[PDB]
RNA sequence: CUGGUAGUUAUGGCGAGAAGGUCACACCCGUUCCCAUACCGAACACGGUAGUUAAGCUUCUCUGCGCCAAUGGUAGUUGGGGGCUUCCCCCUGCGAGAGUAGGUCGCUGCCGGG
RNA sequence: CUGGGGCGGUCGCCUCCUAAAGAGUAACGGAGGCGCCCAAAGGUUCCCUCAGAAUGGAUGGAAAUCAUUCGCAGAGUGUAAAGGCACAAGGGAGCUUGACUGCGAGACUGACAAGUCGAGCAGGGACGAAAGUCGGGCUUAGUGAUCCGGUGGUUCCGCAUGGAAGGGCCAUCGCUCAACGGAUAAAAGCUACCCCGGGGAUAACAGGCUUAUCUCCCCCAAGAGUCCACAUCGACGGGGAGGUUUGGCACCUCGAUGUCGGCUCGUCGCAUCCUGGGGCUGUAGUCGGUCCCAAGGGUUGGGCUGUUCGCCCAUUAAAGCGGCAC
RNA sequence: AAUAGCUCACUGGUCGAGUGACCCCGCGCCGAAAAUGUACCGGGGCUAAACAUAUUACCGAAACUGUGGAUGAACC
RNA sequence: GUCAUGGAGGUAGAGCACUGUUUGGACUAGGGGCCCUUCUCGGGUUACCGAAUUCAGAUAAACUCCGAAUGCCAUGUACUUAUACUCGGGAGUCAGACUGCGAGUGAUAAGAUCCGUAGUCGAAAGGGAAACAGCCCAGACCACCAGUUAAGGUCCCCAAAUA
RNA sequence: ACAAGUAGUUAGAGCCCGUUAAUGGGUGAUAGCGUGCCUUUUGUAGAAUGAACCGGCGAGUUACGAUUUGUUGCAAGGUUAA
């Protein structure tokens, strides 16, 4: 009666803290906001975080419990 | 001893590495039976050990069972090949790790405590030490 | 300045250890190499200490 | 000193106690007007200043709750070795969680009035 | 597909655990969902805060609707689960149709086919005073290629020429093709009458590994035994040995390792059936019980059934149990 | 049969130095029965030729080195 | 490859803040035994049950207030090393095995099965483990009646200690 | 003619020879080491397959296309078919 599972969706970080990215680079794939859109970062319809401009990726604490990812030129 | 209900009917066997994380110092009683090596203790063995203890004390003093058989185990019948999914739940066990105090007694003199506990130890599949608070 | 000598075989050793021995510049068993004593080199030696002997 | 508005993982919070006020800020008074209530001028909005620090606000005190937190030890574990192996032991490096000594009743801006 | 095959179950998609703190990761492993829904349950602007409990109160009950207090969320989020969400992503209300057209730097995922995200640009809008947000829905299922047909459009082609027929292009519809990368538009059985190619890649015999089960031996001792645990039994539980059972696995053998019972011939083990020696006895004697030593020899003939086994008749000192390809 | 017999909880004498519980660690013992033949150190055999801790010599490979030779690549 | 630096990620461990499982005590609303007028409405009764409440104590693959070692992604003006990538021509492979470690299935059986991870075999001769693909040591270009070592050894078979 | 043999190989006396003259030839007491070849396999000395022996015969070819590399001629050209 078991024997089922969905295809794995390859979630998680796609670029490293300190790595240079081009505009549109997906930074994080996620369900909901495990990580929040920081500065120069957008949240897509499926919660995907992407760089809005070229620059360097920085994963940062938001405050105590939450986390954000930013892109600094 | 059986859980009134369980979230999952089937459960990994697990492992028994390391010293018991809790219940290593005798807490409610004067004397305790301490597991020296690890083992699964079945509910049938806990009962056999309890009745042996309690009978010798002659409904005197108190007996705390400090282990509970939370974990189900399954078996396949004889004449059944491998596969076709996990077997039916057969029994209930408490994985006892080394250092875990399994039984505690109070309200009897040392001599009677120490005898009731050796009588219990002979029903358990694990090497035991008697320890006092 | 360190003198590093490969004393044990790489046969049967994991790739990380083999790759480190290669980066140290060691070839066959009893190969010797002379390296400047840095943290970088010290770190390599530590990963493969069981394979090599180190003098000064 | 106080009003506004920011930053900072609550060491900033909660709770308890005290003091303060025409300069603000409040409560407060009123519904004619703009504007309001799925009923209610409660709120929102507008017009006032008789009354009051009671509350909010501000300042001060405290460790009861929370929060922060070493050192040491221990668990675990990379690598290297041994065993009698449900598992356990030794060497090297890393090293928690809990507990604890301790810390905390914030700190740091810019603007307006005084 | 398959711990041989058949029978049963399963087949695509989503969520979780397995999964070893990136990603990925198997099993006829452990759990659940899907093949939709919503004209608002979408967009935007503004405003809001839930579960439960206590106390008080007409119908009114444990529980309806009021009121106060405490309440980080114990609620909710169309729907499984996980991850999120109280500046709400939860709850009201007003206006709306961005559930837009052309696209798209660049990324993710990935054998391919596909799948996913996307700032920004242009057109023309919705809401908002503006800032701005809006290319459906908190996120991740809700689907199916090509070929062929149908319908709508069309500054495309039109077989001498003008047309037309018919085609192309754009849009859209028609399949559990669900065995869900779909052999065809269109498909069930039997073979002991069988045949060929292969396989010890894979079953039936025996060997091997394993020993759950099985046989034997122990530990503890509640008890039974008038009394008395241990003469003899020994519950509840615990530990082994053996490799004769029922099994598990699929390692040798499918260019053949003949498979049950019997006959003939035995040989070996000892966990001993008899005979020999001995301890204990709940051993008066005669008989026994139980344990220890002991494998030298011995260990029946019939009735029934293919039987092994078993029951029976009649004996015997005794009518042993096992291994040797049962 | 009960009474007594013996033997004694309890002693002063001897005779006189140790004696009795309990816990931990090392190494052993029993528990220990299978089928052709010893048959659960490869054998002999071993009381160390076993075990523990420490030490040093030596043996031991087609490893590495020495001598000669052949050969690929890269470089000059 | 290492060093340094930054980061994502919830395993081991641990913990009980949530969810499930769970022991003992205290408390306490009900219900159920027991008589009473009684409608057992409520008393006087209670270890016959029982939901919260706390105090102490356990427990978890599908619990988490926490949380390593490693591994992973990246940066460097660090030190070593020698490959990467692209485009073409030609393949073979799609039965794997055991060992160690981490899991599932199984009985915490299997030389079982199925993944992950490393190694060896496969395709690897040599030495050791009596013999013994997969264990220990170690990689055979050829010749030598030279040498030094590895695992394993040194009384005899049998080279070396009756150290 | 006291020996336990995948038949050799390494060491090696003794005996017998005398060459394409070489640190030669035949034989081999004794000693060490040593499980054919092929196929098929995770793994075969295999108690898996095939071959009694010897000899002969016995399996990637050609044509026409495609593509790629090498070579040669000519080159913004090159080349002819029947
Ligand atoms: C349950 C049986 C298991 C199998 C039996 C065996 C086999 O095939 N036997 C053959 C035999 O046939 C003849 S005997 C009449 C032949 O002479 C004899 O050699 C042999 O081939 C036949 C009886 O089927 N297999 C190897 C395994
Ligand atoms: K025991
Ligand atoms: Mg998967
Ligand atoms: Mg969407
Ligand atoms: Mg090794
Ligand atoms: Mg099978
Ligand atoms: Mg089957
Ligand atoms: Mg992962
Ligand atoms: Mg058409
Ligand atoms: Mg025409
Ligand atoms: Mg398919
Ligand atoms: Mg017939
Ligand atoms: Mg087979
Ligand atoms: Mg069989
Ligand atoms: Mg056989
Ligand atoms: Mg297999
Ligand atoms: Mg044959
Ligand atoms: Mg006997
Ligand atoms: Mg008959
Ligand atoms: Mg037979
Ligand atoms: Mg060499
Ligand atoms: Mg754990
Ligand atoms: Mg956990
Ligand atoms: Mg493995
Ligand atoms: Mg296997
Ligand atoms: Mg092969
Ligand atoms: Mg080899
Ligand atoms: Mg050998
Ligand atoms: Mg071979
Ligand atoms: Mg040598
Ligand atoms: Mg030497
Ligand atoms: Mg010698
Ligand atoms: Mg002779
Ligand atoms: Mg002789
Ligand atoms: Mg033949
Ligand atoms: Mg060609």
PDB file of N, CA and C (backbone and C1' of nucleotides) in Angstrom, chain G residues 82-95:
ATOM      1  P     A G  82      53.476  18.054 -10.490  1.00  0.00           P
ATOM      2  O5'   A G  82      52.021  18.195 -11.149  1.00  0.00           O
ATOM      3  C5'   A G  82      51.091  17.110 -10.941  1.00  0.00           C
ATOM      4  C4'   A G  82      49.809  17.404 -11.674  1.00  0.00           C
ATOM      5  C3'   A G  82      49.886  17.276 -13.198  1.00  0.00           C
ATOM      6  O3'   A G  82      48.645  16.740 -13.630  1.00  0.00           O
ATOM      7  C1'   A G  82      49.209  19.448 -12.646  1.00  0.00           C
ATOM      8  P     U G  83      48.723  15.524 -14.675  1.00  0.00           P
ATOM      9  O5'   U G  83      48.210  16.316 -15.975  1.00  0.00           O
ATOM     10  C5'   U G  83      46.783  16.382 -16.243  1.00  0.00           C
ATOM     11  C4'   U G  83      46.069  17.158 -15.161  1.00  0.00           C
ATOM     12  C3'   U G  83      44.612  17.499 -15.483  1.00  0.00           C
ATOM     13  O3'   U G  83      43.803  16.375 -15.157  1.00  0.00           O
ATOM     14  C1'   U G  83      45.728  19.448 -14.756  1.00  0.00           C
ATOM     15  P     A G  84      42.471  16.338 -16.055  1.00  0.00           P
ATOM     16  O5'   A G  84      41.735  17.647 -15.491  1.00  0.00           O
ATOM     17  C5'   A G  84      40.562  18.056 -16.191  1.00  0.00           C
ATOM     18  C4'   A G  84      40.064  19.380 -15.682  1.00  0.00           C
ATOM     19  C3'   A G  84      39.039  20.009 -16.625  1.00  0.00           C
ATOM     20  O3'   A G  84      37.750  19.595 -16.189  1.00  0.00           O
ATOM     21  C1'   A G  84      40.832  21.504 -16.308  1.00  0.00           C
ATOM     22  P     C G  85      37.005  18.786 -17.361  1.00  0.00           P
ATOM     23  O5'   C G  85      36.726  20.005 -18.371  1.00  0.00           O
ATOM     24  C5'   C G  85      35.811  21.043 -17.949  1.00  0.00           C
ATOM     25  C4'   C G  85      35.921  22.218 -18.889  1.00  0.00           C
ATOM     26  C3'   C G  85      35.426  21.991 -20.320  1.00  0.00           C
ATOM     27  O3'   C G  85      34.010  22.153 -20.389  1.00  0.00           O
ATOM     28  C1'   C G  85      37.529  23.079 -20.354  1.00  0.00           C
ATOM     29  P     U G  86      33.307  21.116 -21.398  1.00  0.00           P
ATOM     30  O5'   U G  86      33.749  21.727 -22.818  1.00  0.00           O
ATOM     31  C5'   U G  86      33.182  22.997 -23.205  1.00  0.00           C
ATOM     32  C4'   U G  86      33.765  23.441 -24.523  1.00  0.00           C
ATOM     33  C3'   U G  86      33.560  22.493 -25.708  1.00  0.00           C
ATOM     34  O3'   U G  86      32.249  22.669 -26.233  1.00  0.00           O
ATOM     35  C1'   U G  86      35.803  23.220 -25.648  1.00  0.00           C
ATOM     36  P     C G  87      31.509  21.317 -26.698  1.00  0.00           P
ATOM     37  O5'   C G  87      32.190  21.103 -28.134  1.00  0.00           O
ATOM     38  C5'   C G  87      32.207  22.220 -29.046  1.00  0.00           C
ATOM     39  C4'   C G  87      33.090  21.886 -30.220  1.00  0.00           C
ATOM     40  C3'   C G  87      32.933  20.468 -30.773  1.00  0.00           C
ATOM     41  O3'   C G  87      31.722  20.451 -31.523  1.00  0.00           O
ATOM     42  C1'   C G  87      35.220  20.990 -30.567  1.00  0.00           C
ATOM     43  P     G G  88      31.180  18.970 -31.833  1.00  0.00           P
ATOM     44  O5'   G G  88      32.254  18.562 -32.949  1.00  0.00           O
ATOM     45  C5'   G G  88      32.438  17.171 -33.151  1.00  0.00           C
ATOM     46  C4'   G G  88      33.568  16.932 -34.110  1.00  0.00           C
ATOM     47  C3'   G G  88      33.922  15.449 -34.230  1.00  0.00           C
ATOM     48  O3'   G G  88      33.090  14.893 -35.239  1.00  0.00           O
ATOM     49  C1'   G G  88      35.827  16.647 -33.581  1.00  0.00           C
ATOM     50  P     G G  89      32.384  13.540 -34.737  1.00  0.00           P
ATOM     51  O5'   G G  89      33.615  12.517 -34.904  1.00  0.00           O
ATOM     52  C5'   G G  89      34.201  12.375 -36.215  1.00  0.00           C
ATOM     53  C4'   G G  89      35.288  11.336 -36.178  1.00  0.00           C
ATOM     54  C3'   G G  89      34.982  10.020 -35.459  1.00  0.00           C
ATOM     55  O3'   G G  89      34.212   9.168 -36.292  1.00  0.00           O
ATOM     56  C1'   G G  89      37.104  10.777 -34.829  1.00  0.00           C
ATOM     57  P     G G  90      33.185   8.202 -35.522  1.00  0.00           P
ATOM     58  O5'   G G  90      34.153   7.266 -34.647  1.00  0.00           O
ATOM     59  C5'   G G  90      34.835   6.198 -35.318  1.00  0.00           C
ATOM     60  C4'   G G  90      35.602   5.381 -34.317  1.00  0.00           C
ATOM     61  C3'   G G  90      34.815   4.687 -33.197  1.00  0.00           C
ATOM     62  O3'   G G  90      34.192   3.457 -33.549  1.00  0.00           O
ATOM     63  C1'   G G  90      36.710   5.702 -32.303  1.00  0.00           C
ATOM     64  P     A G  91      32.585   3.384 -33.481  1.00  0.00           P
ATOM     65  O5'   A G  91      32.175   2.633 -32.123  1.00  0.00           O
ATOM     66  C5'   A G  91      32.415   3.217 -30.849  1.00  0.00           C
ATOM     67  C4'   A G  91      33.520   2.434 -30.197  1.00  0.00           C
ATOM     68  C3'   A G  91      33.128   1.425 -29.112  1.00  0.00           C
ATOM     69  O3'   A G  91      32.795   0.127 -29.653  1.00  0.00           O
ATOM     70  C1'   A G  91      34.895   2.827 -28.343  1.00  0.00           C
ATOM     71  P     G G  92      31.406  -0.601 -29.241  1.00  0.00           P
ATOM     72  O5'   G G  92      31.662  -1.140 -27.750  1.00  0.00           O
ATOM     73  C5'   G G  92      32.502  -2.299 -27.575  1.00  0.00           C
ATOM     74  C4'   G G  92      33.107  -2.262 -26.197  1.00  0.00           C
ATOM     75  C3'   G G  92      32.151  -2.434 -25.012  1.00  0.00           C
ATOM     76  O3'   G G  92      31.959  -3.824 -24.766  1.00  0.00           O
ATOM     77  C1'   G G  92      33.570  -0.594 -24.634  1.00  0.00           C
ATOM     78  P     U G  93      30.556  -4.324 -24.166  1.00  0.00           P
ATOM     79  O5'   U G  93      30.453  -3.463 -22.819  1.00  0.00           O
ATOM     80  C5'   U G  93      31.268  -3.832 -21.702  1.00  0.00           C
ATOM     81  C4'   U G  93      30.855  -2.959 -20.553  1.00  0.00           C
ATOM     82  C3'   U G  93      29.370  -3.017 -20.186  1.00  0.00           C
ATOM     83  O3'   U G  93      29.170  -4.108 -19.307  1.00  0.00           O
ATOM     84  C1'   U G  93      30.138  -0.764 -20.271  1.00  0.00           C
ATOM     85  P     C G  94      27.768  -4.882 -19.387  1.00  0.00           P
ATOM     86  O5'   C G  94      26.756  -3.726 -18.942  1.00  0.00           O
ATOM     87  C5'   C G  94      26.771  -3.332 -17.573  1.00  0.00           C
ATOM     88  C4'   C G  94      25.532  -2.519 -17.317  1.00  0.00           C
ATOM     89  C3'   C G  94      24.215  -3.199 -17.719  1.00  0.00           C
ATOM     90  O3'   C G  94      23.493  -3.308 -16.508  1.00  0.00           O
ATOM     91  C1'   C G  94      24.288  -0.914 -18.423  1.00  0.00           C
ATOM     92  P     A G  95      22.589  -4.591 -16.184  1.00  0.00           P
ATOM     93  O5'   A G  95      23.449  -5.916 -16.472  1.00  0.00           O
ATOM     94  C5'   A G  95      24.559  -6.250 -15.640  1.00  0.00           C
ATOM     95  C4'   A G  95      24.142  -7.268 -14.604  1.00  0.00           C
ATOM     96  C3'   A G  95      25.158  -7.366 -13.447  1.00  0.00           C
ATOM     97  O3'   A G  95      24.546  -7.606 -12.179  1.00  0.00           O
ATOM     98  C1'   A G  95      24.953  -9.491 -14.503  1.00  0.00           C
TER      99        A G  95
END
